[PDB]
Design a protein around this ligand. Structure first.
Ligand SMILES: *[C@@H]1O[C@H](CO)[C@@H](O[C@@H]2O[C@H](CO)[C@@H](O)[C@H](O)[C@H]2NC(C)=O)[C@H](O)[C@H]1NC(C)=O
Ligand SMILES: *[C@@H]1O[C@H](CO)[C@@H](O[C@@H]2O[C@H](CO)[C@@H](O)[C@H](O)[C@H]2NC(C)=O)[C@H](O)[C@H]1NC(C)=O
Ligand code: NAG
Ligand code: NAG
Lengths: 196, 67, 114, 196
């Protein structure tokens, strides 16, 4: 029914397949290697696995590369192709969540928070953007305003905060390139307090 | 552990400073010749871990007539 | 732009990687590219880039050089069947260290980008 | 042989180039001569400066027009003292590292959302050859807050103190895609938002 994959811009392709032994096969149009991962149930109706193409920060694909991705399922004495896709890696980017969130400095009404990105290709340079949100005491994550950073800025200075107050903070990252490119997962929330 | 004298490369000479393991040496194309672009004059004494003998790496060097 | 922009990025990565390395090879380097021979000069840079790869013994160098060449060749194929004439052979170029070679490599790529 | 002053050339927005030198610190007043050519290409012929610049009635520089500018071929200038021909100096310059664009213009602000602002601007220059530095401050701030921007030439401020007056300014540099200039343009005309 659905075969969806994302490239982390380095050496990992994450695949989900919805619809009993199945796997994803990767066949690149101009590389010597091939890759396979065993699809595992992540729910009752979906399977997933990661294609590992190399070391965490290796650059295994470019915009020129086309990788043929196939879902193969064992049916008795015979294998079958359940889904196929000519994967253009940089058209289907999804990065890892931002990491290493920390408070740079906190005041009574202000707070500067920084983070880093993980396994993001050097090809991006500064062609990246971020979104952040702050969890307030009497509200939930879904109620939190999406803060937009339309440049590669790995920090934010939250203004108009309330003294002596607990907050939580999340940030996600996205490259500007790629038709099907989507946001990274949210980072782990960072908890902090404004000064009294 | 030392390496034997390197094999000769056509139209090139080599003056090894050290025959010991891990040493890096470089072939020099003779007069009237040039290193072909894309080819390397580097060779080094590595270890054949399978046979415990040291040998110079085979260079890709091609010495062509000076254009 | 496009592919050449990525080529710049790869060139900068190679520059970074080779810092902690000892690659004393001399490379044919066109520091003064004539616009009528720019494609020929580019192909000489691409060829000599392979020497850096071979002499490195480093996997990150291998990947990046291979990536750069893929990207570069993809752009040169799109440039049409424009043949250049009266251009020097790669072996006629001045020989220089990795530092100057990479610097001039960046110089010609910037020219293509602009 | 008394050393000649150093010639400094800057290419302003690739529209013209001023090549100047400090006329002072000279025992005898002299109109220094300038010649130029380009290495390789079809411009390797010695040219006389056709537009001398003067400070205190003596030559202090030379100006070249757009048609005489070649960014990717080495520029060669020869400074010489006509009263003492032995005093001759040659400089070889890379003009792609010496481009100084005009200041950004037409800065605009618009509300993206509650307490969020987006800054836009224009440059009289090809976009992708430029990088940018955005600066903002409130009237209370001791110094400017700054953030780099690439050729996207947009900037978002996700957290804005509504009780304070902000000032924004932007500058640009010919770096790093078409050249590697170190010098920045002058600051744009600044704009303000809100009030105290
Ligand atoms: C919030 O903290 C960050 C991280 O220290 C600051 O960003 C740095 O600013 C300096 C000065 O411009 C730069 O040299 C660094 O490169 C920046 N670091 C990063 C990760 O970008 C930022 O200036 C602080 N914000 C405020 C308003 O003080
Ligand atoms: C490039 O040099 C020219 C010539 O010196 C500069 O133009 C001068 O600018 C000031 C404006 O008051 C005056 O000295 C003259 O009116 C101008 N001279 C002219 C037009 O021939 C120009 O400013 C220089 N460019 C830059 C950006 O420094
Ligand atoms: C320099 O040149 C100007 C213009 O030709 C001339 O008026 C002036 O007398 C000269 N100064 C000298 C020769 O010192
Ligand atoms: C600035 O805006 C004006 C219109 O208000 C326009 O005429 C001009 O071209 C703009 N400048 C640039 C560099 O686009």
């Amino acid at each position: 029914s659905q075969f969806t994959c994302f490239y982390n811009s380095r050496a990992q392709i994450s695949c989900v397949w919805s619809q009993t032994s199945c796997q994803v096969h990767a066949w690149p149009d101009r590389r010597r290697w091939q890759q396979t991962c065993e699809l595992l149930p992540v729910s009752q109706a979906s399977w997933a696995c990661n294609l590992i193409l190399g070391a965490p920060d290796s650059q295994k694909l470019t915009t020129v590369d086309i990788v043929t991705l196939r879902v193969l399922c064992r049916e008795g004495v015979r294998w079958r192709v359940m889904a196929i896709q000519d994967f253009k890696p940089f058209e289907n980017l999804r990065l890892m969540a931002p990491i290493s969130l920390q408070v740079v400095h906190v005041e009574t009404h202000r707070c500067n928070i920084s983070w880093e990105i993980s396994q993001a290709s050097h090809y991006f340079e500064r062609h990246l953007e971020f979104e952040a949100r702050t969890l307030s005491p009497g509200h939930t994550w879904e109620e939190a305003p999406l803060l937009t950073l339309k440049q590669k800025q790995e920090w934010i200075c939250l203004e108009t905060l309330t003294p002596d107050t607990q907050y939580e903070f999340q940030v996600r990252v996205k490259p500007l390139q790629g038709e099907f490119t989507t946001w990274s997962p949210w980072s782990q929330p960072l908890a902090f307090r404004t000064k009294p | 552990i030392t390496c034997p004298p390197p094999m000769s490369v056509e139209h090139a000479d080599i003056w090894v400073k050290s025959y010991s393991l891990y040493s890096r040496e470089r072939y020099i194309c003779n007069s009237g010749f040039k290193r072909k672009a894309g080819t390397s004059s580097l060779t080094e004494c590595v270890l054949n871990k399978a046979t415990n003998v040291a040998h110079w790496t085979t260079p890709s060097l091609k010495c062509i007539r000076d254009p | 732009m496009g592919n050449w922009v990525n080529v710049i990025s790869d060139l900068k990565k190679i520059e970074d990687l080779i810092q902690s390395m000892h690659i004393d090879a001399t490379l044919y380097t066109e520091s003064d590219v004539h616009p009528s021979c720019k494609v020929t000069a580019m192909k000489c840079f691409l060829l000599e880039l392979q020497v850096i790869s071979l002499e490195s013994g480093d996997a990150s160098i291998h990947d990046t050089v291979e990536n750069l060449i893929i990207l570069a060749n993809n752009s040169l194929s799109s440039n049409g069947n424009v043949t250049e004439s009266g251009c020097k052979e790669c072996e006629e170029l001045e020989e220089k260290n990795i530092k100057e070679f990479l610097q001039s490599f960046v110089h010609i790529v910037q020219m293509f980008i602009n | 042989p008394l050393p000649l002053p150093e010639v400094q050339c800057f290419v302003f927005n690739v529209e013209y180039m001023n090549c100047t030198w400090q006329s002072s610190s000279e025992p005898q007043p002299t109109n220094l001569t300038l010649h130029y050519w380009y290495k390789n290409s079809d411009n390797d012929k010695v040219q006389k400066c056709s537009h001398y610049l003067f400070s205190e009635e003596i030559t202090s520089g030379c100006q070249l027009q757009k048609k005489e500018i070649h960014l990717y071929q080495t520029f060669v200038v020869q400074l010489q003292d006509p009263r003492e021909p032995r005093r001759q100096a040659t400089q070889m310059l890379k003009l792609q590292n010496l481009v100084i664009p005009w200041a950004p213009e037409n800065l605009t602000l618009h509300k993206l959302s509650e307490s969020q602002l987006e800054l836009n601007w224009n440059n009289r220059f090809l976009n992708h050859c430029l990088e940018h530095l955005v600066q903002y401050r409130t009237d209370w701030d001791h110094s400017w807050t700054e953030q780099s921007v690439d050729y996207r030439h947009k900037f978002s401020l996700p957290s804005v103190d509504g009780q304070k007056r902000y000032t924004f300014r932007v500058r640009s540099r010919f770096n790093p895609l078409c050249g590697s200039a170190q010098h920045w343009s002058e600051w744009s005309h600044p704009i303000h938002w809100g009030s105290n």
